[PDB]
Amino acid sequence: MNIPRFGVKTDQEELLAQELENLNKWGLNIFCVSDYAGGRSLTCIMYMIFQERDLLKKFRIPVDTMVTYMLTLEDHYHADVAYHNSLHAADVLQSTHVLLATPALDAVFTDLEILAALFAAAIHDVDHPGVSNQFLINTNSELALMYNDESVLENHHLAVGFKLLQEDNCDIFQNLSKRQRQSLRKMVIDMVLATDMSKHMTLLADLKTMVETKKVTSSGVLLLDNYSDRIQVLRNMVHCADLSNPTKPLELYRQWTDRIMAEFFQQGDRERERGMEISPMCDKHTASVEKSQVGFIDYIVHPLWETWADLVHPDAQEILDTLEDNRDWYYSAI
Amino acid sequence: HMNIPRFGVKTDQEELLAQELENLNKWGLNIFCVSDYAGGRSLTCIMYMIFQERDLLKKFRIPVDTMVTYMLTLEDHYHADVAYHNSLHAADVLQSTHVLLATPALDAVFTDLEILAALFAAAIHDVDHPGVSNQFLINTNSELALMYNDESVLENHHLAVGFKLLQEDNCDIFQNLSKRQRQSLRKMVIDMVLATDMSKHMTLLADLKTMVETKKVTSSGVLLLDNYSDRIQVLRNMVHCADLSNPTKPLELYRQWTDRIMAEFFQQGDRERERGMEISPMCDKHTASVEKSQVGFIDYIVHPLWETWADLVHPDAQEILDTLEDNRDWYYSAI
Ligand SMILES: CCCCOc1cc(C[C@@H]2CNC(=O)N2)ccc1OC
Ligand SMILES: CCCCOc1cc(C[C@@H]2CNC(=O)N2)ccc1OC
Ligand SMILES: [Co+2]
Ligand SMILES: [Mg+2]
Ligand SMILES: [Mg+2]
Ligand SMILES: [Zn+2]
Ligand SMILES: [Zn+2]
């Protein structure tokens, strides 16, 4: 198979090259990347992130195996889901890539831990059906039964992500040792399960406790002594990345908002057709797009990022300012 | 439990939908219009209307709310981003089957249970289709090809999904069938859905042809099928004909069907090319003749199938055959 310059075929290589200049920045526009990559934002961004961090050489991952797996992974996100499609995966992965580079975390994580974080981020919503856990529980679906109603989707994303390693020429981890594969798998499971919003309040309270007794070295770089603390930081980092839409430039944030509301509204419509209770914010006749975002920021997103900014102080100050400006925009657009 | 709309589904174009639905029992029904006027819920709409039309809810004691919940659940398991094998195709095949069941030469031949089975089989026959052929699933070593030992991989999956969905909340439309009836329906549905696997076409058609050559007709010119073997044979071919009915519909619909199957094929080809796989037949957008392919499809598969069907039901399908021949000419003179 052909391995194109940026991992995917493109009719607009120069415009794509120009956006990829921003690979390592919060200000990257993944929507442009997606347009210029013919819809393959996940395969493109993951290829580039992997080349950037030299991960193929570091783990002896054959390049065609990497691309085969990434295409397979991307193909198992549904294009007909308005928000939880591969563009969201790509965005969360890219955001995780930037967050990994934060100065307060310099030289803290091993390449294996980094590998785990990025893989977790890429697979974290694979095969999302565009309806919430509660919808699967209320319909008595096979998936809710399979996972005892507990983190139904997050369990499924993990099973699908690892299972796809078994399709032809897809085992990107073939050259990791046993201990390496086991440690990565354990870390990935931990990170993806922590993306379940029902764990959000628990996650935030523990992040706070950890921040209270944080240790900094000479130059304000974090000291993470033990596994427990390292995976705590990584699970919260992927969570922050998942909830990073309101921290991005308003132009991008507004596109993410339209997408989530389209997805929620379609769920609400399906609920109404089936005689089910309509889930929170899923009723198009009564929901306010702008008020929902304000409440979302005030009670979920800002308290999370404020605690994160505390952890990595002063590295995330800008994100917090942006977050405050965006709250104000939605508050005024009411 | 829920308030059942007049035509089974919510609509802001109720009168336009009512007009199209007058053609429910006809080959000339335009399902694309039904879809537009039923907010994209073609499968739920048409299936509801057919079940009322044949009084199947009362005959099998199927609660309406249960029927509707199942139908919406089934239709939602067809993918919208798949150009051809979406719920519109299922709606189409179901409605065609419904018309083929009513064909004068088959009058009083099938029980209500056999009719229920045929319609259920048609409605579920492609559910959860990923938009790629069996060979793509086999070549990629997918979980499904492994489960089913590379044999009718998709068709087995359609069956598994269609049946499993009965177990979702308030979805068991067969709750009031007896145990014998359930077993018999299950078996018939399996045979019909598996017969939609194109690698079976040759044997289905050879079997149908043999039946035509020794067919028995009653007093009125109505077909005589004494035994089950013959009946499931005709049902299998009927659902296969319906699945292969696009070239037999008015040209305007047939052309839309062709546009859709090529978009789906080219997408598969694009994915094969990305993966460095050998590109499946007619899936290369760079080197394909849409018109020749349609001509080949009719010449080698569709016309021998429909000619043999028309011979079985003679003369009820004469018009279907004429349209087919005219549509073939069009794609031929459009080469
Ligand atoms: C309904 C509006 C209030 C919430 O908005 C959003 C909510 C999410 C959370 C989704 C749901 N569960 C998740 O794991 N992620 C993401 C982006 C949003 O807006 C841009
Ligand atoms: C590639 C063009 C030649 C074939 O065209 C068609 C082929 C099908 C058959 C599909 C493929 N497998 C099936 O089980 N059903 C249906 C409609 C078509 O066109 C209108
Ligand atoms: Co899809
Ligand atoms: Mg998720
Ligand atoms: Mg099929
Ligand atoms: Zn997510
Ligand atoms: Zn079909």
Specify the CATH number for the domain of residue A4.
1.10.1300.10
Q: Which of A8, A140, A275 shows the shortest C-beta gap to B168? A: A140
> Do you find a cis peptide bond into A314, omega within 30 degrees of 0?
yes
Helix pair B201-213, B303-312: axis angle to 10 deg: 30
B316-to-A31, A274, B99, B105, B306 alpha-carbon distances in Å: 55, 40, 11, 7, 12
Instruction: Tell me how far apart the alpha carbons of residues B48 and B38 are, in angstroms, rounded to a whole number.
Output: 12
DSSP state of B298: I
Ligand 2 pocket, residue B256 CB under 6 Å: no
**Distance, CA of B292 to CA of A322 (rounded, Å):** 58
Helix (H) or strand (E) holding B66: helix B64-76
Residues 6+ apart with CB under 8 A from B273: B279
B275 → closest Cβ in A68, A80, A275: A68
Resolution of the structure, angstroms: 2.2
CA distance A307 to A305: 5
Say which residue the tokens 């994303």 belong to: A157
Cis peptide before B5, with omega less than 30 degrees from 0? no
The amino acid present at B151, given as its one-letter code, is E
Supply φ then ψ for residue B175, to 5 degrees.
Answer: -60, -25
- The pair phi, psi for residue B157, each rounded to 5°, is -65, -40
B78 to chain A nearest CA, in Å?
A: 11
* Residue in B96, B101, B89 with CA at minimum distance from that of residue B127: B89
Q: Which residues span the domain enclosing B149?
A: 1-335
Catalytic residue among B77, B85, B158, B303: B85
Question: Per-residue b/e over A190-224, b at no fewer than 16 CB within 10 Å?
Answer: bbbbbbbeebbeebbeebeebbeebeeeeeebbeb
Contacts of B81 (CB under 8 A, 6+ apart): A78, A79, A80, B131
CA-CA-CA-CA dihedral for A71, A73, A74, A78, to nearest 10: 140
Length of chain A: 334
The H or E element that residue B213 is part of is helix B201-213
Interfacial B residues in 74-93 facing A (CB < 8 Å): 76, 79-81
Residue B163 Cα distances to A293, B71, B299, angstroms: 40, 12, 35
Write down how long chain B is. 335
- Do residues B268 and B280 lie in contact, with contact meaning Cβ atoms separated by under 8 Å? yes
What is the distance between the alpha carbons of residues A203 and A154, in angstroms, rounded to a whole number? Answer: 15
Q: At what angle do helices A200-212 and A302-311 cross, to 10 degrees?
A: 30
Q: What phi and psi values does residue B223 have, to the nearest 5 degrees?
A: -65, 150
Distance, in Å, from the CA atom of B240 to the CA atom of B237, rounded to the nearest integer, reads 5
Contact A163 B143 (CB under 8 A): yes
CB atoms within 10 A of CB A114: 20
Number of domains into which chain B is organized: 1
SS (H, E, C) chain A: CCCCCCCCCCCCHHHHHHHHHHCCCCCCCHHHHHHHCCCCHHHHHHHHHHHHCCHHHHCCCCHHHHHHHHHHHHHCCCCCCCCCCHHHHHHHHHHHHHHHCCHHHCCCCCHHHHHHHHHHHHHCCCCCCCCCHHHHHHCCCHHHHHCCCCCHHHHHHHHHHHHHHHCCCCCCCCCCCHHHHHHHHHHHHHHHHCCCHHHHHHHHHHHHHHHHCCCECCCCCECCCCHHHHHHHHHHHHHHHHCCHHHCCHHHHHHHHHHHHHHHHHHHHHHHHCCCCCCCCCCCCCCCHHHHHHHHHHHHHHHHHHHHHHHCCCCCHHHHHHHHHHHHHHHHCC
Exp. method: X-ray
